[PDB]
Design an enzyme around this catalytic site. Structure first.
Site, PDB file in Angstrom:
ATOM      1  N   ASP A  64      31.470  49.663 -42.888  1.00  0.00           N
ATOM      2  CA  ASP A  64      32.033  48.912 -44.008  1.00  0.00           C
ATOM      3  C   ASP A  64      31.023  48.449 -45.067  1.00  0.00           C
ATOM      4  OD1 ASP A  64      33.575  47.287 -45.617  1.00  0.00           O
ATOM      5  OD2 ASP A  64      33.895  45.752 -44.116  1.00  0.00           O
ATOM      6  N   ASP A 120      34.056  49.494 -51.563  1.00  0.00           N
ATOM      7  CA  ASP A 120      34.456  48.985 -50.250  1.00  0.00           C
ATOM      8  C   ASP A 120      35.089  50.013 -49.304  1.00  0.00           C
ATOM      9  OD1 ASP A 120      35.136  47.189 -48.211  1.00  0.00           O
ATOM     10  OD2 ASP A 120      36.851  46.403 -49.258  1.00  0.00           O
TER      11      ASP A 120
HETATM   12  C1  LIG Z   1      41.934  45.709 -44.735  1.00  0.00           C
HETATM   13  O1  LIG Z   1      41.439  44.796 -45.700  1.00  0.00           O
HETATM   14  C2  LIG Z   1      42.011  44.717 -46.989  1.00  0.00           C
HETATM   15  C3  LIG Z   1      43.313  45.220 -47.283  1.00  0.00           C
HETATM   16  C4  LIG Z   1      43.847  45.125 -48.580  1.00  0.00           C
HETATM   17  C5  LIG Z   1      43.067  44.524 -49.574  1.00  0.00           C
HETATM   18  N1  LIG Z   1      41.825  44.032 -49.328  1.00  0.00           N
HETATM   19  C6  LIG Z   1      41.277  44.109 -48.076  1.00  0.00           C
HETATM   20  N2  LIG Z   1      39.987  43.571 -47.936  1.00  0.00           N
HETATM   21  C7  LIG Z   1      39.491  42.882 -46.732  1.00  0.00           C
HETATM   22  C8  LIG Z   1      38.227  42.179 -47.199  1.00  0.00           C
HETATM   23  C9  LIG Z   1      37.192  41.989 -46.048  1.00  0.00           C
HETATM   24  O2  LIG Z   1      37.275  41.014 -45.302  1.00  0.00           O
HETATM   25  N3  LIG Z   1      36.198  42.969 -45.929  1.00  0.00           N
HETATM   26  C10 LIG Z   1      35.168  42.736 -44.870  1.00  0.00           C
HETATM   27  C11 LIG Z   1      36.152  44.103 -46.730  1.00  0.00           C
HETATM   28  N4  LIG Z   1      35.392  45.145 -46.398  1.00  0.00           N
HETATM   29  N5  LIG Z   1      36.907  44.157 -47.876  1.00  0.00           N
HETATM   30  C12 LIG Z   1      37.720  43.023 -48.384  1.00  0.00           C
HETATM   31  C13 LIG Z   1      36.918  42.147 -49.317  1.00  0.00           C
HETATM   32  C14 LIG Z   1      35.485  42.195 -49.551  1.00  0.00           C
HETATM   33  C15 LIG Z   1      35.017  41.234 -50.491  1.00  0.00           C
HETATM   34  C16 LIG Z   1      33.571  41.091 -50.897  1.00  0.00           C
HETATM   35  C17 LIG Z   1      33.162  40.285 -52.000  1.00  0.00           C
HETATM   36  C18 LIG Z   1      31.789  40.164 -52.362  1.00  0.00           C
HETATM   37  C19 LIG Z   1      30.791  40.852 -51.623  1.00  0.00           C
HETATM   38  C20 LIG Z   1      31.194  41.655 -50.522  1.00  0.00           C
HETATM   39  C21 LIG Z   1      30.224  42.371 -49.741  1.00  0.00           C
HETATM   40  N6  LIG Z   1      29.467  42.961 -49.091  1.00  0.00           N
HETATM   41  C22 LIG Z   1      32.555  41.766 -50.173  1.00  0.00           C
HETATM   42  C23 LIG Z   1      36.083  40.453 -50.980  1.00  0.00           C
HETATM   43  S1  LIG Z   1      37.581  40.913 -50.282  1.00  0.00           S
HETATM   44  C24 LIG Z   1      38.998  43.614 -49.016  1.00  0.00           C
END
Ligand SMILES: COc1cccnc1N1C[C@H]2C(=O)N(C)C(=N)N[C@@]2(c2cc(-c3cccc(C#N)c3)cs2)C1
Length: 387
Positions: free
Chosen positions: A229, A36
């Site tokens: 992303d 991610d």
């Molecule tokens: C700033 O965001 C965060 C801070 C601290 C911890 N987690 C965070 N997340 C935000 C979240 C978010 O909405 N986005 C869009 C992201 N890129 N990552 C996070 C997450 C992504 C997923 C997820 C699950 C399954 C498939 C895909 C697929 N394809 C993405 C679950 S949480 C983790």
């Protein structure tokens, strides 16, 4: 290809995300971790859960260190902070001590059917939770080893649905830690500046649908920010941009009418096996700020990238898809839809992101994804949004 040990080390698909195998603790505990670039925390399931068949067991790791601090991330999860030795089997041959958020409580985080048990946030410390003092995994890796401060991602969409067994046995792409593998792309790599180091923020300066200028004030394209992303499935666009883009895409594909549910990304559209009318759908080009003043370049994707293959509700022999472009109230998000068309280089060392046509992107005999330049563009700094 100078990083054969890391080539093809990813699995998954756009809708479920892509993960790499990692180990945590001593002795090593193997877990599948979602890649991610949209977050900065390394967090893993650390307690039993209906959708997990394995998880991090801190009591079984001799190298586990308790930081005695909790962490809450609103889906959502809660966990306990600590550190341990971490490795990436099909990655650099090093072991680093990194922060780990042991997930003990979660809601809509883990997905039934998915094969991942944790998430690897590759972005910067500014967005790490609880705060920027929690050093991200990549920062630790670079600080503790000689691995270059850069990683590249090749997300490979299959171009068709992958069932439960297939998605587990198929190669979903490559994450090259500390380098660029030339076998993953064709043509040249073009770089856009990382505007600021928190999310992997970039600046889009022009948008075209089949060569036709969307013609919006370029600030709209980056309101309130534009990021790359891997943790987002779709190409997400700010509300106003989405509305204009959809209107233009409908106009270009007007020889066929689709229900509103399709454009809302809510319902799938199907065609007899092999007859998807790719040609009636327009290509989409995003021009990005270049490294040279007044210079830009463009990346172009095909409907094969923005129409996500899904299995028909009746698992028939029809080829079905969902529209993978949707609106956002948090700026532009270049998710898997964009990434599956290109080899993306996150050059943290030189504060820039590279794009090259992916060796694994899906296309047809008439059109291909592309990365071309340069183009003369003025006042590009003005395209960036300021709160
Ligand atoms: C700033 O965001 C965060 C801070 C601290 C911890 N987690 C965070 N997340 C935000 C979240 C978010 O909405 N986005 C869009 C992201 N890129 N990552 C996070 C997450 C992504 C997923 C997820 C699950 C399954 C498939 C895909 C697929 N394809 C993405 C679950 S949480 C983790």
């Amino acid at each position: 290809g100078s990083f054969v040990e890391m080539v093809d080390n990813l699995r998954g698909k756009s809708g479920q995300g892509y993960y790499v195998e990692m180990t945590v603790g001593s002795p090593p505990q193997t877990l599948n971790i979602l890649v991610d670039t949209g977050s900065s925390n390394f967090a893993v399931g650390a307690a039993p859960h209906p959708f997990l068949h394995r998880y991090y067991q801190r009591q079984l790791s001799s190298t586990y260190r308790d930081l005695r601090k909790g962490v809450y991330v609103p889906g959502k999860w809660e966990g306990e902070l600590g550190t341990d030795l971490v490795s990436i089997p099909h990655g650099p041959n090093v072991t680093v001590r990194a922060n780990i958020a042991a997930i003990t409580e979660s809601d809509k985080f883990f997905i039934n059917g998915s094969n991942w048990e944790g998430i690897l946030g590759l972005a910067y410390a500014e967005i790490a939770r609880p705060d920027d003092s929690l050093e991200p995994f990549f920062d630790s890796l670079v600080k503790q080893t000689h691995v270059p401060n850069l990683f590249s991602l090749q997300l490979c969409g299959a171009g068709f649905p992958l069932n439960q067994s297939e998605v587990l046995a198929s190669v979903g792409g490559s994450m090259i830690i500390g380098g660029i593998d030339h076998s993953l792309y064709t043509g040249s790599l073009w770089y856009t500046p990382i505007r600021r180091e928190w999310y992997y923020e970039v600046i889009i300066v022009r948008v075209e649908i089949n060569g036709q200028d969307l013609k919006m004030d370029c600030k709209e394209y980056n309101y309130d920010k534009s990021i790359v992303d891997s943790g987002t499935t779709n190409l997400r666009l700010p509300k106003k941009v989405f509305e204009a883009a959809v209107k233009s895409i409908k106009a270009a594909s007007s020889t066929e009418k689709f229900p509103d549910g399709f454009w809302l990304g809510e319902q799938l559209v199907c065609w007899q096996a092999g007859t998807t009318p790719w040609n009636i759908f327009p290509v989409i080009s995003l021009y990005l700020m270049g490294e040279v003043t007044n210079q830009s370049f463009r990346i172009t994707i095909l409907p094969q990238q923005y129409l996500r293959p899904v299995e028909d509700v009746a698992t028939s022999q029809d080829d079905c898809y969902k529209f993978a472009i949707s609106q956002s109230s948090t700026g532009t998000v270049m998710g898997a839809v964009i990434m599956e068309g290109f080899y993306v280089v996150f050059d943290r060392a030189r504060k820039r992101i590279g794009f090259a046509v992916s060796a694994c992107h899906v296309h047809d005999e008439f059109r291909t994804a592309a990365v071309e330049g340069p183009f003369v563009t003025l006042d590009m700094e003005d395209c960036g949004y300021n709160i």
